Amino acid sequence: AGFANIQGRADLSDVHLPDQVIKDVLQTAPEASVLLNRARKVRMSSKKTKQPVLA
Amino acid sequence: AGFANIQGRADLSDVHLPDQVIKDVLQTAPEASVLLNRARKVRMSSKKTKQPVLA
């Protein structure tokens, strides 16, 4: 054997030296859109809308 | 003999002419650390911590 022997990290399986886990995801919140909040909103009831204009 | 004699400082022992002692040590009080107060604080239970991230 000799004198150099010491217990190391690599002598144990990962089950006995587990990483601590933080359960929640590190993320920033989903950002809201510009046009769907600034623009005037109308319900469409057809694929196309028509309006007359003075020209 | 003579007229020249007078009692000097050097004619007494240091026991009888003591310096006054102020017992309290002159010092400024210990400062606080920056990161141990400013950062967010968590208790670790293993050499490593692992967290999931949106990527």
Give a quick rundown of the structure.
The structure is cut from a larger assembly and holds 2 copies of chain A (55 residues). Chain A contains 1 helix and 1 strand.
Task: Present the secondary structure layout.
This is part of a larger assembly, with two copies of chain A (55 residues).
Chain A: E1 20-21, H1 35-38
Supply database-style keywords:
part of a larger assembly, 2 chains, about 55 residues, little secondary structure, 1 helix, virus, Mycobacteriophage, HK97-fold
User: Which overall shape of chain A is indicated by the principal axes computed on the Cα atoms?
Assistant: rod-shaped
In percent, how helical is the residue content of chain A? Answer: under 10%
Span of the ends, CA to CA of chain A: 101 Å
Tally of DSSP helical segments of chain A: 1
Give the oligomeric state: part of a larger assembly
The major sheet of chain A is characterized as: none
The largest interface is: A-B, 10 and 11 residues
Spatial extent as radius of gyration of chain A: 32 Å
**SSE ordering of chain A:** EH
Structural class of chain A: little secondary structure
Fraction of residues in β-strands of chain A: under 5%
Total strand segments of chain A: 1
Protein name (chains A, B): Capsid protein
Subcellular location (chains A, B): Virion
Organism (chains A, B): Mycobacterium phage Muddy
PDB class: virus
Question: What features would you describe in this structure?
Answer:
This is part of a larger assembly, with two copies of chain A (55 residues). By secondary structure, chain A is largely without helices or strands. Helices cover 7% and strands 4% of the residues of chain A. Chain A contains one helix and one strand. Chain A is rod-shaped, with a radius of gyration of 32 Å. The A-B interface holds A 17-22, 24-27 and B 44-54. Chains A, B: It comes from Mycobacterium phage Muddy. Chains A, B: This is Capsid protein. Chains A, B: It is found in: Virion.
